[PDB]
Amino acid sequence: QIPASEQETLVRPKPLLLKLLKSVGAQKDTYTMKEVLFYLGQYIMTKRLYDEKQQHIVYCSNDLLGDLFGVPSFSVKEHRKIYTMIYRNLVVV
Protein backbone atom coordinates (compact mmCIF):
# COMPACT_ATOMS: atom_id res chain seq x y z
CA GLN A 1 0.00 0.00 0.00
CA ILE A 2 1.17 3.50 -0.96
CA PRO A 3 0.36 6.51 1.29
CA ALA A 4 -2.26 8.90 -0.11
CA SER A 5 0.17 11.84 0.09
CA GLU A 6 2.73 10.02 -2.09
CA GLN A 7 0.17 9.32 -4.83
CA GLU A 8 -0.24 13.08 -5.30
CA THR A 9 3.54 13.62 -5.86
CA LEU A 10 4.15 15.77 -8.99
CA VAL A 11 6.48 14.11 -11.54
CA ARG A 12 7.99 14.62 -15.00
CA PRO A 13 8.49 11.41 -16.99
CA LYS A 14 11.74 11.00 -18.90
CA PRO A 15 11.49 10.69 -22.71
CA LEU A 16 10.74 6.94 -23.01
CA LEU A 17 8.10 6.84 -20.26
CA LEU A 18 6.59 10.06 -21.67
CA LYS A 19 6.46 8.46 -25.14
CA LEU A 20 4.40 5.46 -23.97
CA LEU A 21 2.13 7.59 -21.74
CA LYS A 22 1.18 9.76 -24.75
CA SER A 23 0.30 6.71 -26.91
CA VAL A 24 -2.30 5.88 -24.23
CA GLY A 25 -3.82 9.35 -24.63
CA ALA A 26 -2.10 11.19 -21.82
CA GLN A 27 -1.34 14.53 -23.50
CA LYS A 28 0.67 16.32 -20.81
CA ASP A 29 4.26 16.42 -19.52
CA THR A 30 3.65 16.75 -15.75
CA TYR A 31 1.57 14.26 -13.71
CA THR A 32 0.72 13.08 -10.24
CA MET A 33 1.94 9.54 -9.54
CA LYS A 34 -1.72 8.46 -9.36
CA GLU A 35 -2.12 9.66 -12.96
CA VAL A 36 1.05 7.91 -14.14
CA LEU A 37 -0.21 4.65 -12.65
CA PHE A 38 -3.65 5.03 -14.23
CA TYR A 39 -2.18 5.54 -17.71
CA LEU A 40 0.36 2.71 -17.26
CA GLY A 41 -2.56 0.39 -16.46
CA GLN A 42 -4.31 1.60 -19.62
CA TYR A 43 -1.12 0.98 -21.63
CA ILE A 44 -0.84 -2.59 -20.30
CA MET A 45 -4.45 -3.20 -21.36
CA THR A 46 -4.02 -1.71 -24.82
CA LYS A 47 -0.92 -3.82 -25.48
CA ARG A 48 -2.40 -6.96 -23.86
CA LEU A 49 0.57 -7.40 -21.51
CA TYR A 50 -1.49 -8.65 -18.54
CA ASP A 51 -1.55 -12.46 -18.08
CA GLU A 52 -4.48 -13.97 -19.98
CA LYS A 53 -4.59 -16.66 -17.26
CA GLN A 54 -5.30 -14.00 -14.61
CA GLN A 55 -2.37 -14.84 -12.29
CA HIS A 56 -1.64 -11.19 -11.33
CA ILE A 57 1.47 -10.97 -13.54
CA VAL A 58 2.33 -8.55 -16.35
CA TYR A 59 4.58 -10.05 -19.06
CA CYS A 60 6.52 -7.02 -20.32
CA SER A 61 9.65 -8.60 -21.84
CA ASN A 62 10.37 -7.36 -25.38
CA ASP A 63 7.98 -4.41 -24.97
CA LEU A 64 8.98 -0.79 -24.21
CA LEU A 65 7.58 -1.33 -20.69
CA GLY A 66 10.03 -4.19 -20.09
CA ASP A 67 12.84 -1.96 -21.38
CA LEU A 68 11.87 0.85 -18.97
CA PHE A 69 11.25 -1.37 -15.93
CA GLY A 70 14.29 -3.58 -16.59
CA VAL A 71 12.31 -6.78 -15.86
CA PRO A 72 10.73 -9.51 -18.06
CA SER A 73 7.63 -9.60 -15.82
CA PHE A 74 6.31 -8.38 -12.48
CA SER A 75 3.50 -8.95 -9.97
CA VAL A 76 0.65 -6.40 -10.00
CA LYS A 77 0.20 -6.97 -6.24
CA GLU A 78 3.61 -5.46 -5.34
CA HIS A 79 2.82 -1.74 -5.45
CA ARG A 80 6.02 -0.47 -3.82
CA LYS A 81 8.15 -2.40 -6.33
CA ILE A 82 6.09 -0.89 -9.17
CA TYR A 83 6.43 2.64 -7.72
CA THR A 84 10.22 2.14 -7.54
CA MET A 85 10.45 0.97 -11.17
CA ILE A 86 8.40 4.03 -12.27
CA TYR A 87 10.43 6.49 -10.11
CA ARG A 88 13.63 5.45 -11.92
CA ASN A 89 11.98 6.79 -15.12
CA LEU A 90 11.01 10.28 -13.98
CA VAL A 91 12.08 13.38 -12.13
CA VAL A 92 10.18 14.63 -9.09
CA VAL A 93 9.04 18.25 -9.36
Q: Which residues bind ligand 07G (CB under 6 A)?
A: 2, 37-38, 40-41, 44-45, 50, 58, 76, 79, 82
- Residue 55 CB, nearest distance to ligand 07G (Å)? 11
Q: How far is the CB of 30 from ligand 07G (least distance, A)?
A: 18
Q: DSSP character for 20? A: H
Question: In this structure, how many other beta carbons lie within 10 angstroms of the beta carbon of residue 44?
Answer: 18
Cβ proximity to ligand 07G, 27 vs 54, nearer residue: 54
Q: Rounded to the nearest whole angstrom, what is the least distance from the CB of residue 58 to ligand 07G in the complex? A: 5
Could you give the C-alpha distances from 44 to 9, 20, 73, 83, 91, in angstroms and in order? 22, 10, 12, 15, 22
